[PDB]
Amino acid sequence: GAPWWKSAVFYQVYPRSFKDTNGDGIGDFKGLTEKLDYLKGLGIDAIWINPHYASPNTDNGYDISDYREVMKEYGTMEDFDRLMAELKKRGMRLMVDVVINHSSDQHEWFKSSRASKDNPYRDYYFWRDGKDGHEPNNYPSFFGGSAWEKDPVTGQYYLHYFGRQQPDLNWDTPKLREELYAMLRFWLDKGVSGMRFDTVATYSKTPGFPDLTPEQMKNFAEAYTQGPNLHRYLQEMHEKVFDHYDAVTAGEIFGAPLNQVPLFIDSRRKELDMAFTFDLICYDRALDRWHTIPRTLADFRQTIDKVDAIAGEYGWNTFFLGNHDNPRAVSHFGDDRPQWREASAKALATVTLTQRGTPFIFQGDELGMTNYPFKTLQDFDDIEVKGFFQDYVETGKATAEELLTNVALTSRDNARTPFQWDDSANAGFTTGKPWLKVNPNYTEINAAREIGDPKSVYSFYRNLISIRHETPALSTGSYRDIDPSNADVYAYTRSQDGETYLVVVNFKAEPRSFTLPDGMHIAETLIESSSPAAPAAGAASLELQPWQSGIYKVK
Template sequence: MPVCESPSYHGYDVTNYRVIEKDYGTEQDFLDLMAACDARGIRVIVDFVMNHTSNHHPWFQSSSDPDSAFFDWYRWSNTHPGYTGPWGQPVWHQHQNGLYYYGLFWSGMPDLNYTTPAVKQEMFDVAAYWLTEMRVAGFRCDAAKYIYEDGATLEDTAATFSFWEDFQIWYKTVNPEAMAVGEVWDRTDVVVQYVGSKFDFCFEFDLASLILHSISIGNPTELRSTMAKLKTVYPYHQYGTFLTNHDQDRVFDVLQGSVDRAKLAASIYLTLPGIPYLYYGEEIAMAGVKPDEDIRRPMQWNAETNGGFTTGEPWHDLNPNYPDYNVADMQSDPDSIWHHY
């Protein structure tokens, strides 16, 4: 998840795009991490939240004054425009100044207004900062469907497609070997529109759901036909395979706590075409169901206090299964799911 300064535990409401969240450390700590990874042949991408900021961001706090130079950095309306979001959620929120501002996800994360050229330039400059000064290799671009709105059309607009084309040209100019993966949480026929001239690749959500469904019902027929389709609609292998992510119940719970099913799921998605993503802990059968905090618990390294995650106070209690599901024990068990991975 994001590592920029933020008032929340999850970091998707950024208050400073050029500062590391103090709970994680300092900019030098991050650079030390990059150096350690580089020494091991590992390249790192970061979660980049371009669609919105925190309502505590200085830009937004300044923009609440209609006379401010930042007023047009967000979408403001004198009256409520009268429509809701893609899943029926409120997207216009009344500010204490009496105006309404647009925030797709919630009132604490107002959307940036990319029709203002200065906004686009600043966020592109932020990307260059992370590629050059912070030495990352690319980005996982959050909420990629929602950058531009067209009236009440809030996703997949023509301007959004053009934006990501411009962004790809920009970051490839800064670093030709940089990459970006798009989070376009939608069906395949929508996702493919973002791949190629916009993102290097995107996550394949339909495939992830279908892998788990096929295992649950014990029938691979639909999975076979879907794989045949993916082979024809995507550029060669240019999609991200996964099982579940930080917004979904953990795969071990989805598969009813069955280690055998979890191993089968791993065998399928790690040998299919595509670019595989492991959500930390799935390789040791970490459990977790929503709320979100409970699917983002500390990693379970061993059976000791706090699972070996920290000698201090963890940000969240560990899952109760950590004495039986942890890296150290599974490394010594040749039949463990960790060895299977």
């Protein structure tokens, strides 16, 4: 049959904001472990946790100083091993982030590498002579300024596509690749069975490091994804590591042209199993990265369609509406106003759990958690906001009020407010002071209230997950968008083995009449949200309530 990961439902945990168990205001491993019964009851097959490794935390745990030790704030290695044992007892799996484009500059490999020109760690990184009293070339960093940083100790520059404190690892060095593979086995042998390769497209560097041409400088991110040994290295990794495990691998793919996505995920190529791309979640984001741009459902579905098409017959996509870097799903894609929050959250759940691909639910979206009501720029932890302030407010391009109004809608801090467990102090997230303020709407929106209520957003997610689990077409089935130009009602089929299901979701806060394709008829209604009655068997049309969603078997 199909690989386990194609029919699994994943849940993303950002452990810092999930559950604190020692009152320091920061979520931890023990907190996740104590909530596994909750996640199991929701119907979750596998949990992806954000970086859990030893890190100085200059970049949210993506600057790793020891790949074989855990992040101290989350707990100890034994806490981690206990988490794995409790997952295994429940038949659940763990996926981890793998950040091997670069390490922390505090990694012992880098401390050794930088110490002299002649040491066995020199080539674990990229060290080059400057040119003409300047850097080795004109490479810009994703985080601003030059991608080359001089080290007075040897007089050479080291490469960092990202932060200055994140030197790129040298995949051209076989010994380095072998270290990385050994490290991956360390985690897989502990029972980890999913690995998400962050910024996977930048692993391979261009031989000789020529200057970027003026055209390339205008999209340097794309140039950095075109290293000539990229797919060779991923194939080697697959052969040396993943051939020996049942684990799923996923690539965080960005910077590359859409048409290159299949190279990472086509099963025949033996590279990675599935793709994370950002076309949908960034579909309404302005170029400045803090404004939004008006879009419609037509744009939404067309974006879904082109990514689904790119996976084709042999590739596989993840699907998500939320993550740790983005505004809340219901606020972003639904309508978080009080009249529509629950209805639209349910509609987005139906979309999520009937998309072709492996769905990832972001912690708290199953409750219909919303964006946070920021009142001042001082309310943001978000390091990006500080940068926007410097680049746009201090330069006089925008006022602080304009920045606040808009980043409130787009900031990743919206996703990072603590998970709302109940209506006790700080929503039961912590007995102390939470590292980031809890949304005051926790008094209404919390797991304790929702789990006990058959009509809640939580209960609807759980019901959908059960339906998806028992309906093969809704995971591995084909997908067909009935009308990509329609900006009111999202309608599509999922089909497998002669069984065809129709999904219909009203994206308007108004009644809409929906006519099935001529010749198609409803056989059964599996589930609906915001509907007072299912259609009759034989129906050729639906009368949809505001934000109504449904899954139907068609004749």
